[PDB]
Design a protein around this ligand. Structure first.
Ligand SMILES: Cc1cc2c(cc1C)N(C[C@H](O)[C@H](O)[C@H](O)COP(=O)(O)OP(=O)(O)OC[C@H]1O[C@@H](n3cnc4c(N)ncnc43)[C@H](O)[C@@H]1O)c1[nH]c(=O)[nH]c(=O)c1N2
Length: 272
């Protein structure tokens, strides 16, 4: 009965359970951000199957009257694999974004470990050019030394970017080892993106940072339509509700699927 526990953080194992969970968030004035979980994705066949499963999700969400908003890791759809002379991740991402876009939806390219940052930001730029900044977004992680520079380099795209602290175990040659620096850099990324007038998703459960961002938005006259807070399903549900009740946009990341063990284990690891 790991599931009796994991149900807090994972919508369920089916597309149906995910849609039901988005519908519940929506009834509470909160948007959803769907994440298909998968573990075996280590072959071009399986990466493309995964992409097809994300597309089936997008169709089901659209059928259920939900604007598709889905986050994917490009490695899961073939990033770094060549199929007939083109990168499989880019090929599959195009299929997935085109389908989301047809239904007025949006895809976020999540950011993986440091080895995939350059390719992801190159691919993101390509895809923004093909589909528009209103339909594809990405993520920057405040623990990396390179992130402030990366954010500034994307300003010409006026891009939708989610700021996160960072999820991977990265060495000190790549990521600030001091949590104080990670947190200060997080504010810097959020504030520079907001000052540039780009749509910003403030993905954090750190209430001190949440309060400071509220302060910043107030002091700078930034509208509550210009950014949103984002949280993982099941973490600080009280803040999710409170921020929605105070007029902020809140969008909750909802993982689903049969392969939930690793995701669930990371939620357990991060228990305060
Ligand atoms: C919507 C969204 C989307 C993503 C990500 C986060 C979110 C919210 N992340 C993960 C992110 O990098 C970061 O690891 C987590 O958000 C945790 O960091 P915090 O900002 O919550 O602060 P921090 O880790 O400091 O935690 C702050 C507080 O939040 C609460 N909290 C956090 N985790 C909890 C838990 N498991 N159980 C109970 N309470 C908990 C506790 O109160 C804790 O003190 C991510 N990372 C990445 O590298 N690439 C990505 O694409 C993404 N995508």
């Amino acid at each position: 009965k790991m599931w009796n526990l994991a149900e807090r953080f994972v919508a369920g194992e089916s597309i149906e359970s995910a849609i039901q969970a988005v519908q519940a968030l929506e009834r509470d004035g909160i948007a959803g951000n769907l994440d298909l979980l998968g573990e075996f994705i280590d072959s071009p066949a399986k990466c493309t199957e995964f992409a097809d499963d994300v597309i089936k999700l997008i169709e089901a969400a659209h059928a259920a009257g939900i604007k598709p908003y889905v986050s994917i890791k490009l490695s899961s759809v073939g990033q770094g694999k060549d199929e007939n002379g083109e990168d499989l991740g880019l090929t599959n991402a195009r299929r997935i974004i085109a389908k989301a876009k047809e239904y007025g939806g949006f895809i976020c390219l999540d950011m993986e470990d440091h080895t995939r940052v350059d390719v992801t930001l190159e691919q993101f730029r390509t895809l923004v050019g093909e589909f528009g900044a209103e339909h594809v977004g990405t993520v920057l992680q405040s623990y990396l030394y390179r992130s402030l520079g990366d954010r500034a380099s994307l300003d010409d795209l006026r891009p939708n970017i989610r700021m996160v602290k960072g999820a991977y175990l990265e060495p000190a040659t790549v990521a600030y080892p001091d949590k104080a620096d990670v947190d200060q850099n997080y504010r810097r990324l959020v504030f520079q993106h907001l000052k540039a007038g780009n749509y910003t998703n403030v993905a954090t459960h750190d209430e001190r940072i949440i309060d400071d961002v509220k302060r910043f938005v107030l002091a700078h006259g930034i509208g509550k339509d210009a950014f949103e807070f984002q949280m993982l399903y099941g973490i600080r549900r009280d803040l999710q509700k409170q921020l929605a009740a105070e007029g902020y946009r809140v969008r909750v990341y909802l993982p689903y699927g049969r392969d939930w063990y690793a995701y669930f284990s990371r939620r357990i690891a991060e228990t305060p």
